[PDB]
Design brief:
Bound molecules: calcium ion
Entry title: Bst DNA polymerase I Large Fragment mutant F710Y/D598A with 3'-amino primer, dGTP, and calcium time-resolved 4h
CATH superfamily of the largest domain: Ribonuclease H-like superfamily/Ribonuclease H
Radius of gyration: 26 Å
Name: DNA polymerase I
Keywords: DNA Polymerase, NP-DNA, Origin of Life, Time-Resolved Crystallography, DNA binding protein, REPLICATION-DNA complex
Assembly: trimeric
Largest sheet: 6 strands, mixed
PDB class: replication/dna
Structural class: alpha+beta
Length: 579
Amino acid sequence: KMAFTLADRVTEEMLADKAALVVEVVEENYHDAPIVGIAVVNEHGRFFLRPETALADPQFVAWLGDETKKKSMFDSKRAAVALKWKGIELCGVSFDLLLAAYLLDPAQGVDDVAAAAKMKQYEAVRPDEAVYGKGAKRAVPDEPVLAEHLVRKAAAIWELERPFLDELRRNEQDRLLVELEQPLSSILAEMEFAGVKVDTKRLEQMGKELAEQLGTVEQRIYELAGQEFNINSPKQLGVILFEKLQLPVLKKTKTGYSTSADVLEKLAPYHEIVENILHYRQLGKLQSTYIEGLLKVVRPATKKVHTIFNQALTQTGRLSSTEPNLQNIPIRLEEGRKIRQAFVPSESDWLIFAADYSQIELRVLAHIAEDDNLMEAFRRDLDIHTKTAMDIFQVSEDEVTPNMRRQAKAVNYGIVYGISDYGLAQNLNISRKEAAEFIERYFESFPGVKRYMENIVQEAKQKGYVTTLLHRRRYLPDITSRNFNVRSFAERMAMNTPIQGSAADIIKKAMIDLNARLKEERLQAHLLLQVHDELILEAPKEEMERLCRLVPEVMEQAVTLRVPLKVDYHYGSTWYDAK
DNA sequence: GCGATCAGCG
DNA sequence: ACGCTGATCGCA
Ligand SMILES: [Ca+2]
């Protein structure tokens, strides 16, 4: 029903200097995945290509790799990484409909061309789910059906770039697309394809010792409980604690007794079993997610894991990381932190280099709220978390344990993002009256923060949305809801999203500038991971001293705020030692 | 599939 | 009754 050429060879009119390009990878994880078909729409017509012909044709390969031949795409990172696994470089992507859609409205959850097209009343393309099926029924259709679907996606991309660019421009988001998100897409593609090497011998040895300690703690739990049970069974666990042992019920879930770690910590005066259960769960978490789960995704020939950074998922502009998640590798407990010893450089005589912003959201908040005292604090490079711990526990700076600092950290963010006196009383094990008075005293010292929280909620109600420093936008329709609980959740999004999102804009800008400086200095160093406010790189040993000067400077100069940005950095033989 | 839970990020 | 995530597991 749409005219296109089912091409047998590549011809010169398919290689125009501007085109819409579809390089179709059906598998959710695109690493090393098949490319099932290619479509090209340009001023000369519409074309479908079989991958085994086009990707072995040297004029098409060169066209893909020519930066001056501009391509409009949907999810260019997926295509660029799948092509890298084919030994082919994709350059010249000048418009990415996924990232355009995500900037205009992150809550659409746009995951295919049909969903983005609908935003502009374009419906001459089908949802990917309707063409391929779902679950065990998923299949590549017959070539005529495939070709027409890939041509329709390309034709849609071709039509939609202009209306998306126009709305982006009206939102002040077009430089955000073209100068930030789209260049970041190519950097993430390199990071994902390079991967992270893993010491599988060390992991597997940790797994065996973990399995030994797991059984022991099981038996101490069975003994303390009198009997056996499925320590992960909420009904059987709930029955042991709250019926057999008759511990108080501090919290219920929609399903029944809560056994979350906060409950169990409060029950520790009552019985020794709850601490063994916490230790059991923690050991089980390391074994399931970080030992077995990671060995499951290691590519065996290279011992590399290749995460996927979702760049158009979070409602704040943060990345997320999937399969494996390399943004939530343990660090706080020493047992879990040793897993970071299995993450190693990919070449001998290379090192891991990590750098991260300290207290970035509080600095962003100081700049945006223009709170005099909070700006002064950061102009002094004070450690707000340690200072707040000193205040809470009535101790001195040397007496601040790491755990009391983690506590103060959650108080600092909690208060600015709307924790109630109840919530803070629960977290510090203090009375509710002392929690309310503490909070009022915190805003006495930072009245500009309080003004800003009130102003940003009223601005959300008037505009319908909130924005970040680089004009990322999040719509908040529940901000005028009549239900109190719905409206309250939306108000705390208005308080938090401009700050967390601005901090995500800054690290993205820093990654782009870092890559350019690394190329300007001709270093072999390259990014491996982003963890929200940290960058992880690997480089030859011989470049570490350069990176110690270059990387903190690039990150600190990514933007100019009314307070300085501060960056800490470490390097070493494994990710564990890069702290 | 979904909720509870927990790992990370602020 | 601070916010943003992803993976695992049991399933009142
Ligand atoms: Ca940090």
